[PDB]
Amino acid sequence: RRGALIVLEGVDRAGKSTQSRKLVEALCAAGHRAELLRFPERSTEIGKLLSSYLQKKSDVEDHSVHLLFSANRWEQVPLIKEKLSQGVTLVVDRYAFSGVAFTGAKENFSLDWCKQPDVGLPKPDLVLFLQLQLADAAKRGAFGHERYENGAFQERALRCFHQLMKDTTLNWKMVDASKSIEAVHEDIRVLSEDAIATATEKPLGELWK
Numbered sequence: 001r002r003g004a005l006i007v008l009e010g011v012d013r014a015g016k017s018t019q020s021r022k023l024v025e026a027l028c029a030a031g032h033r034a035e036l037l038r039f040p041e042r043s044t045e046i047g048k049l050l051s052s053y054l055q056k057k058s059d060v061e062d063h064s065v066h067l068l069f070s071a072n073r074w075e076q077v078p079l080i081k082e083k084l085s086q087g088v089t090l091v092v093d094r095y096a097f098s099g100v101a102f103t104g105a106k107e108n109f110s111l112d113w114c115k116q117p118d119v120g121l122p123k124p125d126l127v128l129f130l131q132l133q134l135a136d137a138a139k140r141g142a143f144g145h146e147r148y149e150n151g152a153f154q155e156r157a158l159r160c161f162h163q164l165m166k167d168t169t170l171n172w173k174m175v176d177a178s179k180s181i182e183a184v185h186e187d188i189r190v191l192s193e194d195a196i197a198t199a200t201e202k203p204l205g206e207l208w209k
């Protein structure tokens with residue numbers, strides 16, 4: 001019985017990391033075998049280049065950085081397939097959707113070109129989108145000094161996310177991320193339990209193909 005592949009997406013400060021940590025904790029406490037993954041995975045060679053870029057310690061050509069973000073997902077595919085095959089549900093904090101939405105927010109980047117590198121990745125069984133007004137997301141303290149940490153860019157990224165949500169091949173679920181940490185968590189936990197129990201009857205799919 002394979003594990004489910006659950007992705008959490010949303011703009012910066014939507015609560016993705018907090019909810020991904022709480023979800024794994026709750027699933028494990030309820031007897032599931034579940035583990036947390038995140039993208040970018042900054043521990044690899046590629047992940048280190050990505051981290052320097054995001055921190056503005058380095059500059060990288062836009063197409064190149066887009067391809068490094070996708071390569072950082074592919075390098076984890078053998079691990080993802082192994083874990084899911086062993087029955088381990090994986091909770092992923094950002095995935096290909098963030099990749100497309102952030103690069104697609106830049107000038108002269110078509111959604112189509114941005115999607116291609118991630119075509120064929122393991123297809124999530126559930127994609128949770130943590131919806132929150134950008135204003136309230138900004139009021140979750142203040143902007144940091146990392147790349148993309150500004151309102152106009154966040155708004156273009158959000159528009160790209162909405163284009164991706166038209167894709168009916170994917171099991172998108174909207175989450176009202178404006179509620180408390182515990183209320184949002186319960187919403188996410190119940191959706192995840194349902195996906196683990198019913199979405200896994202079919203083989204792992206391939207993204208965007």
Ligand SMILES: Nc1ncnc2c1ncn2[C@@H]1O[C@H](COP(=O)(O)OP(=O)(O)OP(=O)(O)O)[C@@H](O)[C@H]1O
Pocket residue numbers: 010011012013014015016017018019140141177178179180181184
């Ligand atoms: N439901 C919530 N209500 C209020 N604050 C929240 C809520 N969820 C998370 N936060 C707070 O908002 C901040 C950002 O949360 P978190 O790190 O989980 O977001 P994120 O989506 O991972 O952000 P990033 O996009 O930068 O990685 C944290 O200080 C966190 O405690």
Ligand SMILES: Cc1cn([C@H]2C[C@H](O)[C@@H](COP(=O)(O)O)O2)c(=O)[nH]c1=O
Pocket residue numbers: 012013039040054069070093094095096098099100102103147148
């Ligand atoms: C996974 C991923 C994240 N990003 C961005 C979103 C965030 O602004 C940034 C840091 O992510 P984080 O908010 O998860 O720490 O990286 C990309 O631009 N492309 C990607 O493929």
Ligand SMILES: [Mg+2]
Pocket residue numbers: 016017018
């Ligand atoms: Mg985070």
Ligand SMILES: [Mg+2]
Pocket residue numbers: none
């Ligand atoms: Mg084509």
